[PDB]
Design a binder for this molecule. Structure first.
Ligand SMILES: CCCCCCCCCCCCCCCCCC(=O)OC[C@H](COP(=O)(O)OC[C@H](N)C(=O)O)OC(=O)CCCCCCCCCCCCCCCCC
Ligand SMILES: CCCCCCCCCCCCCCCCC[C@@H](O)O[C@H](CO[C@H](O)CCCCCCCCCCCCCCC)COP(=O)(O)OCC[N+](C)(C)C
Length: 507
């Protein structure tokens, strides 16, 4: 029974660790699922719930009452939906003759609505699965309460060690992965929403992201973070209100409310994720975890290169052999997407490949200057692609069959589903050969991720010791040459002796 006892002990340890996982994620799941349902089913009640949650995430003091109100509102919604499911209600559609004009199925005119249009209409056909979503939300809230109660019961009843082993470093990252990486993660979330939407709203996001980048010292970020969080929550609320209540495609492009085409609300969830990260990062950014906190001698562990441990080998791989991987990724991103923006990628890759050694020899100042130049170019191309996404709506009307070179040059094509689709235009041959697989964003984003990671490496002391090693190698090269000459001389003497002996034997 010793094996059974060991399994029971492992299960108890896993359960003890869990409560900790539930504290960070339980909150993330409750904020995320309600917003997902609210965007899935637009409603006035959903709008109120979303607004309350949106305010709750950036500010902690509003969390208690918001959590209290969540279950009340969800119970109210469930009860009122079951009440209106009895269909005891028993309830102008004037089509235009010839300002917005359309011919296909709409919602104002071409369909009968039992309320007016400005409020979401709820009717339960199945009457069982049509109210399941709110029930699931209530169940999740109950689970969260149960978790808190269990924690209360366990309250009443019942880093410097990183470098020794790889498992210790793994534990440290699991504990504080977000502590030192939150800023980069929220930057990546911003580019994620920008790539996903390709609307006018994400143009606003990108302009604000460049404003964040240009103040690259972290104290300016400290000054400007609360304003960004307030802007983000107000913007999300505004977008939800706009969703609830001239070519058709162009109208779609700008985020606006049209009965015939309604801007997708599923995409918004991605924007919400960005706010969550920013809000979470902000509390950490403010908190610093100061209650934990977990050139003579600023480098306690200079000797990664020697490699006495497994973690040392992984460390040297990260701090020494990742710059060239960055260069390879830059080249791949430039070459795979044949638009004229990867030509800049190719040129940058060539120059960096040629001068990487002397760049590493340089002090951090010029290195970060050039690296910031590269990152700025990358974000510029991503913003330019999102801006030229406007040439996806007023595209068929003009660009096709005229100014074809323009489209081939900048690789104009739509990648979002909120338009017609790729791989259909080629059916008609308008003598333009639309590049369908060409335009994309994932490679630019991944290059952005690698650039930020390398920039972080440059700031770290570890690179500084590696640079010292590079200086030493640059000094040695001449001695290496002389040793090579000595080896060649020894070999040639050996061969001469063997040949002479053979000739003597022949004689
Ligand atoms: C099926 C699909 C699978 C897909 C898998 C994908 C896997 C992706 C993995 C991505 C890993 C990315 C690792 C990034 C590590 C960044 C390290 C880094 O930036 O360190 C730098 C920082 C420096 O400290 P600071 O507090 O900033 O210093 C104060 C500052 N300088 C000041 O003056 O104010 O912080 C530090 O110095 C901390 C140093 C930590 C060293 C940790 C080394 C980790 C090595 C990881 C190796 C991974 C190997 C994986 C092998 C897999 C094989 C199958
Ligand atoms: C290598 C940069 C890659 C990203 C940007 C360009 C990508 C394509 C072209 C790549 C050419 C690389 C070879 C040219 C390198 C010149 C040397 C480089 O180090 O210049 C440094 C920095 O020069 C700049 O990086 C010039 C970069 C040229 C391209 C800038 C592109 C920026 C984004 C917008 C592009 C818009 C194109 C047009 C759109 C309509 C200056 O060195 P240093 O004297 O030690 O530092 C001075 C710091 N000061 C100024 C504060 C005193």
């Amino acid at each position: 029974l010793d094996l059974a006892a060991s399994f029971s002990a492992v299960l108890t340890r896993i359960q003890v660790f869990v409560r900790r996982l539930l504290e960070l994620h339980v909150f993330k799941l409750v904020a995320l699922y309600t917003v997902w349902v609210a965007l899935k089913e637009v409603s006035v009640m959903n709008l109120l719930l979303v607004v309350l949650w949106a305010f709750a995430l950036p500010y902690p003091r509003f969390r208690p009452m918001a959590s209290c109100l969540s279950t009340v509102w969800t119970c109210i919604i469930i009860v009122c939906k079951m009440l209106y499911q009895l269909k005891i209600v028993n309830p102008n559609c004037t089509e235009p003759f010839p300002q917005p004009l359309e011919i296909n199925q709409s919602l104002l005119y071409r369909g009968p609505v039992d309320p007016a249009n400005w409020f979401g209409v709820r009717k339960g056909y199945p009457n069982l699965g049509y109210i399941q979503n709110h029930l699931q939300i209530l169940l999740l809230l109950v689970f969260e309460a149960v978790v808190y109660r269990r924690q209360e019961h366990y309250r009443r009843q019942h880093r410097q060690r990183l470098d020794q082993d790889l498992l210790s470093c793994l534990k440290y990252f699991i504990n504080f992965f977000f502590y030192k990486f939150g800023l980069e993660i929220c930057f990546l979330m911003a580019v994620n929403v920008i790539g996903q939407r390709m609307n006018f709203m994400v143009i606003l996001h990108g302009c604000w992201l460049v404003a964040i980048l240009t103040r690259r010292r972290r104290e300016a970020i400290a000054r400007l973070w609360p304003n960004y969080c307030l802007f983000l929550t107000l913007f999300l609320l505004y977008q939800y209100l706009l969703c609830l209540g001239m070519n058709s495609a162009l109208i779609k492009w700008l985020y606006l409310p049209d009965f015939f085409r309604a801007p997708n609300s599923t995409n918004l969830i991605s924007d919400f994720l960005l706010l969550l990260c920013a809000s979470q990062q902000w509390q950490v950014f403010s908190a610093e975890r100061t209650e934990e906190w977990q050139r003579g001698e600023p480098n306690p562990i200079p000797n990664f290169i020697h490699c006495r441990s497994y973690l040392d080998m992984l460390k040297v791989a990260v701090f020494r052999y990742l710059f060239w991987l960055v260069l390879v990724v830059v080249f791949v991103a430039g070459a795979t997407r044949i638009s004229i923006f990867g030509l800049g990628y190719l040129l940058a890759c060539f120059y960096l490949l040629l001068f990487g050694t002397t760049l590493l020899q340089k002090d951090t100042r010029a290195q970060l200057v050039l690296w910031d130049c590269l990152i700025l170019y990358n974000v510029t191309v991503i913003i330019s692609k999102n801006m030229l996404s406007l040439l996806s709506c007023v595209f068929v009307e003009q660009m096709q069959s005229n100014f074809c070179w323009v489209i081939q040059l900048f690789s104009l094509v739509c990648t979002v589903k909120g338009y017609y689709d790729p791989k259909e235009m080629m059916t008609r041959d308008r003598d333009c050969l639309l590049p369908v697989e060409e335009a994309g964003i994932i490679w630019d984003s991944i290059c952005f991720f690698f650039l930020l990671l390398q920039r972080r490496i440059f700031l770290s002391h570890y690179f500084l010791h590696v640079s010292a090693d590079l200086k030493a190698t640059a000094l040695q090269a001449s001695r290496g040459f002389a040793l090579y000459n000595a080896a060649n001389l020894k070999s040639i003497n050996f061969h001469r002796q063997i040949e002479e002996k053979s000739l003597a034997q022949l004689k």
